[PDB]
């Protein structure tokens, strides 16, 4: 039911990898071609997770050479801090060195994941109780604003704490999960982008975003990073406030869902098929869905209903987005949006819904749950 579909996956990486050398890919630009990268965006992990996972499945040493050298060039890249002042420490290195400590149990890759988590530490903001986004401390306009994909970031900060015993790391990791629940997710269930506090005393602003439609708008990619990041969080804290707040998100997107099974851009524009596509987002929340469904009672009959869920989404995927390997296509799934309102690849593969689709198909095919925890964790 999944074979097929991963064996396009498959087959394009391997091509990918002869062809890309030692770059990455990031998102393609009007065409079935990826634009490459000198490992300098914050997209450069899910490659390495791609790697990672064609390996564990297939037991191919083709994918596992090429997911070893994108963890040495991550070790470079920490060891110059290039490109690292933002808060997707844990995108980048958690998919790439911790994913290889947790495949193979290999010393140095958790010595370089550690070494990550320690810098991403370092983006805590005590006067505000959150961990910086983007820019440097005290950055005029960004200084006290948290972005809803950092709670895909915090399991670089769980695991580290897990690790290495230091209780700093789940304190900061949970103060922030919670603000996030609090601020950024609304009480219909959907989710603003980003939220600004005052910087000196971390006094709630306003919530809003520069990716959404407009502030009070639904991005589908926001919503979904809720739904997976607030599930990774209530596994590692076994905090059921959040799982709950994993659920009702979860909810919220599926009852949005158009006629194809693959959502639009944003819920608050027409839902209408000119209108831009995000297949990342549904990628994203077909792993959501399965990571909730993975913390729930198997006597819960909710647990089955998003275990279908996630199914018929990765199917819906499949069907009406996944390139097959003809050689040429470079990318597992068309149609994600970068940056819809600034007009940055906004029909285009993306390297995180790459991710999170062969993610969800690993899943369901194999029970292998990516690179967010240990496995029985
Ligand atoms: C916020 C930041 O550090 N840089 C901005 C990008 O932010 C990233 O956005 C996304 C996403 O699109 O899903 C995921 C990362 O968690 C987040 O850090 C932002 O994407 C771009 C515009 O597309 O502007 C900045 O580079």
Redesign the pocket.
């Known amino acids: 039911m999944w074979q097929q579909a991963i064996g396009d996956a498959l087959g394009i990486t391997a091509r990918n990898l002869k062809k890309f050398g030692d770059r990455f890919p990031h998102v393609s630009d009007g065409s079935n071609k990826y634009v490459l990268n000198d490992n300098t965006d914050?997209t450069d992990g899910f490659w390495s997770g791609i790697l990672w996972l064609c390996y564990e499945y297939t037991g191919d040493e083709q994918y596992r050479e090429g997911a070893v050298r994108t963890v040495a060039s991550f070790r470079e890249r920490l060891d110059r801090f290039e490109n690292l002042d933002?808060?997707?420490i844990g995108?980048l290195y958690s998919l790439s060195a911790k994913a290889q400590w947790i495949v193979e149990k290999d010393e140095s890759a958790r010595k370089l994941a550690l070494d990550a988590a320690d810098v991403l530490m370092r983006r805590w903001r005590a006067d505000a109780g959150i961990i910086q986004?983007?820019?440097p401390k005290g950055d005029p306009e960004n200084g006290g604003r948290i972005?809803i994909?950092?709670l895909?970031?915090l399991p670089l900060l769980l695991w580290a704490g897990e690790q290495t015993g230091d209780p700093e790391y789940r304190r900061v990791a949970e103060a922030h999960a919670l603000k996030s629940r609090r601020f950024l997710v609304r009480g219909d269930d959907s989710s603003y982008h980003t939220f600004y506090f005052d910087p000196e005393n971390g006094n709630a602003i306003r919530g809003g975003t520069?990716?959404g439609n407009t502030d009070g708008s639904t991005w589908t990619?926001?919503q979904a990073?809720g739904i997976y990041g607030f599930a990774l969080n209530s596994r590692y804290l076994g905090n059921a406030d959040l799982l709950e707040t994993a659920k009702r998100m979860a909810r919220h997107f599926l009852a949005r869902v158009p006629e194809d099974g693959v959502v639009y851009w944003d819920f608050e524009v027409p839902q209408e098929p000119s209108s831009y596509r995000d297949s990342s987002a549904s990628a994203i929340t077909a792993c959501g869905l399965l990571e909730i469904a993975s913390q729930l009672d198997e006597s819960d009959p909710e647990r089955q209903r998003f275990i279908d869920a996630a199914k018929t989404t990765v199917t819906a995927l499949r069907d009406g987005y996944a390139e097959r390997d003809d050689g040429e296509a470079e990318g597992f799934i068309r149609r994600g949006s970068?940056?819809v309102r600034?007009g940055?690849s906004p029909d285009d593969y993306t390297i995180?819904g790459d991710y999170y689709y062969l993610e969800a198909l690993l899943r369901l095919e194999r029970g292998v749950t990516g690179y967010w925890y240990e496995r029985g964790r």
């Open positions: 914050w933002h808060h997707n995108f986004a983007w820019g972005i994909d950092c895909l970031n520069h990716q990619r926001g990073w970068y940056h600034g940055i995180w």
